[PDB]
Design brief:
Protein name (chains A, D): Ribose 5-phosphate isomerase
Distance between the termini of chain A: 33 Å
Strand order of the largest sheet of chain A: 2-1-3-5-4
Pfam families (chains A, D): LacAB_rpiB
Organism (chains A, D): Trypanosoma cruzi (strain CL Brener)
CATH class of chain A: Alpha Beta
GO biological process, one term (chains A, D): carbohydrate metabolic process
Number of domains of chain A: 1
GO molecular function, one term (chains A, D): identical protein binding
Structural class of chain A: alpha/beta
Number of helices of chain A: 7
Oligomer: homotetramer
CATH architecture of chain A: 3-Layer(aba) Sandwich
Largest interface: A-B, 43 and 44 residues
CATH superfamily of chain A: Sugar-phosphate isomerase, RpiB/LacA/LacB
Order of helices and strands of chain A: EHHEHEHEHEHH
Chain lengths: 153, 152, 152, 153
């Protein structure tokens, strides 16, 4: 009945991982943060934690992923390489909402070096709270994304 | 000659001629190859993403540009193609860093989120900015390829 | 009835009917009063900023909306009018916080920087979000009035 | 021959004031940061430091101002109430450049809670390095801003 939300970061975004845990809780009591990012401030490679969270989402161990890094760009590239993952790099409320409404995104990506924590807060909450629309055209398009995955499997 | 395949969906069709011009503005060496819809009628972004992304994957063009409503769908779909690194950019900084850190080969923009002058800036910056070639970045990009390999 | 004066310059003239509609979308109580140019020919933003800002200052309308290329000129000029608090917004968060913290009475947007769907979001959020009325915010807003007074 | 750049913040942006000093220097050796923000992390009111920096710019004690706060919105409202000041709230490279090119802005405002430090870095550098265009229409429009000031003096 509650909804698990896996969280990953690289090194620069480690400073805000408690923030991320908190922002997930702020979305609602039904959202459970599962912190899977570095345990310390040590330099890491983003694809390893993108992969870690992405696989959890793909295997359905969690419903949602949060990936925070310098820019979030590498996070969104790495995570989308995992089949079943729809990872959206968001920079504001609008992209966060539309990633859910149009793309039924299951991973939100943000940049610690690009986006202020209060906007990251807003992004995480909006992403978790905004439902997928279910509308015919979006379903068809998401299915075409799945078709692209299959053709390369 | 550095060829740049351009794809859009319906809302971004209205600015396709802008994208063609912005690519050229990046320098004489940059050659736009328009692969988007030829009318304003509604299409599905993954069809145009795939088309551009396959061209990049297969080395038929060096770069792609995908423009849609938000660009989010474009970046999800394009990245499903092995060898693609598609970066959804919303400013100069992300456009630059996508090349510097990630050696992105596709740039994604939202026509409904980002004004055309910033889209212009994004495209020019993306094409002009070189990959750093720095050690850690090369290692991380290979790690992306190792994720692809693990699912192929 | 909560009246909202709308002003633009030339690049934002193309979306003036959008702004009129976005104001209405904020709720039935919101009434757009268009005070921008009536043709696409080039104008000077401070003329339209002043016009809208004077209406807000004089209490003839509750709110203003200024749309230009970047909105930066709009926000500089509008703020030169005593009683105006003009907020240049580029997303939902700034639009909300301009009302919550600053009790902004004019919202400024760039047609060349910010896509129309985000402009739509900015306008709706700006108009719908109430000022917090919190103590520190009231004190700081009065401090803004004391800066005006010190130069009048 | 060098160019003084006054820096102010409120409380939340105090954490990054050394960043701001550094970013001004990064624009070039000709740019001299003059830190005028809070000396400590104590809660302050943004208009007081906006005023402080704005007056310095208006009196021409410095050429440029940097104001960093939560959102930067209040900073840009307060600073523009000082005659002679053209304070631009910027959130990216484009607005930073155009504030100089079109508006000959003399104060840049940023939000610590909205904009990541690396974008703030880019904003400050672009603002300081980008020249005013001098073009006829911008001069006329800036003069109309001055005219608005006069009519309320």
């Amino acid at each position: 009945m509650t909804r698990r939300v896996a969280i990953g970061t690289d090194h620069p975004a480690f400073a805000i991982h408690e923030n991320l845990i908190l922002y997930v809780k702020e979305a609602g009591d039904e959202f459970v943060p599962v912190y899977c990012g570095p345990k310390t401030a040590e330099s890491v490679d983003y694809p390893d934690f993108a992969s870690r969270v992405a696989e959890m989402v793909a295997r359905k161990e969690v419903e949602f992923g949060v990936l925070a890094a310098g820019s979030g760009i590498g996070m969104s590239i790495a995570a989308n390489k995992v089949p079943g993952v729809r990872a959206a790099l968001c920079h504001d409320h609008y992209t966060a909402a539309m990633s859910r409404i149009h793309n039924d995104a299951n991973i939100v990506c943000v940049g610690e070096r690009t986006t202020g924590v209060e906007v990251i807060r807003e992004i995480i909450i909006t992403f978790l709270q905004t439902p997928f629309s279910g509308e015919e055209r979006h379903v068809r398009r998401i299915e075409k994304i799945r078709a692209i995955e299959a053709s390369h499997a």
